[PDB]
Amino acid sequence: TGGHLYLVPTPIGNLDDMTFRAVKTLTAVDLIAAEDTRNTQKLLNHFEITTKQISFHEHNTQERIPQLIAKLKQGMQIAQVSDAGMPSISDPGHELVNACIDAHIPVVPLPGANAGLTALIASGLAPQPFYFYGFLDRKPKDRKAEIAGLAQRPETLIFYEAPHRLKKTLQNLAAGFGDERPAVLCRELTKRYEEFLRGSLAELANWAATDTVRGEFVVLVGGNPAPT
């Protein structure tokens, strides 16, 4: 059996969100390439997986990718996992995938947890068509602009936001889209205090300024109801 790269999703805060095939695959490969081996090691212990790990992240790629490709061309079975959910949505994973396609190594993606889509289905927002975006820009000036250039998308839009940034990002959202644009926040997805907060953007920006904001948020935004 030739070398195969397996893309394996991991839980987003609930260990039972692991799949049977994820367990078997991580047990079966010769090596697991992880963003955070210390964090990943916790997951493997809980499922009693003994597979060795190798670190693989954004400070590693230029050194790690050729090492990984080489072991794959030798016939090694390798898994790539991220810190939470769906790997290879981000650059370091996506980059290893392209190297595999280039070296004609097969890539087997396992289906599994994705926070943006999991939130989407419970949001009450129209779940199809949809535009997954992720984090808005870190730089204040660059964010206000990428929002304005999205104010006409007619579909549900999906963002992620870090807690300390939620308030300001909701305000910009409301500035660039309109206060009365429907939206939904998903806090603590898959954990004890999982919570959806639904309302307008103005309404949710306000709420963000009054509360203890903890944990990563999914921020869902209804599309423009009359574009162009």
Distance between CA atoms of 170 and 207, rounded to whole angstroms? 10
Kindly state whether residue 65 participates in binding its own copies, applying the rule CB under 8 A.
no
Among 26, 81, 105, 113, binds its own copies (CB under 8 A): 113
Kindly provide the b/e burial profile for residues 11-30, where b requires at least 16 CB atoms within 10 angstroms of the residue's own CB.
bbbeeebbbeebeebbeebe
Q: What's the closest the beta carbon of residue 70 comes to its own copies, in angstroms? A: 20
Distance between CA atoms of 25 and 64, rounded to whole angstroms? 21
Q: 32: which strand partners?
A: 53, 79
Distance between CA atoms of 46 and 55, rounded to whole angstroms? 19
Among 54, 55, 132, 151, binds its own copies (CB under 8 A): 132
Question: Which residue's entry shows tokens 């639904």?
Answer: 198
Q: Quick one: CA torsion of 94, 26, 68, 12, rounded to 10 degrees?
A: 30
Among 28, 70, 103, 108, binds its own copies (CB under 8 A): 108
Q: How many CB atoms lie within 10 A of CB 142?
A: 11
Among 144, 165, 168, 198, binds its own copies (CB under 8 A): 198
Residues near 50 by Cβ (< 8 Å), separated by ≥ 6?
Answer: 27, 44
Taking the least distance from each CB to its own copies, the nearer of 71 and 198 is 198
Which tokens in the block code for residue 86?
Answer: 């769906």
Among 2, 24, 152, 199, binds its own copies (CB under 8 A): 24
Which tokens in the block code for residue 112?
Answer: 């599994």
Kindly state whether residue 109 participates in binding its own copies, applying the rule CB under 8 A.
yes
Cis before 9 (ω within 30): no
Kindly state whether residue 178 participates in binding its own copies, applying the rule CB under 8 A.
no
Among 124, 140, 199, 225, binds its own copies (CB under 8 A): 124
Kindly state whether residue 107 participates in binding its own copies, applying the rule CB under 8 A.
yes
Kindly state whether residue 28 participates in binding its own copies, applying the rule CB under 8 A.
no
Q: What's the closest the beta carbon of residue 113 comes to its own copies, in angstroms? A: 4
Among 39, 98, 139, 140, binds its own copies (CB under 8 A): 98
Taking the least distance from each CB to its own copies, the nearer of 65 and 167 is 65
Binding site residues, its own copies, CB under 8 A: 7, 11-12, 14-21, 24, 85-90, 93-94, 97-98, 101, 107-115, 117-122, 124, 126-134, 155, 189-190, 194, 196, 198
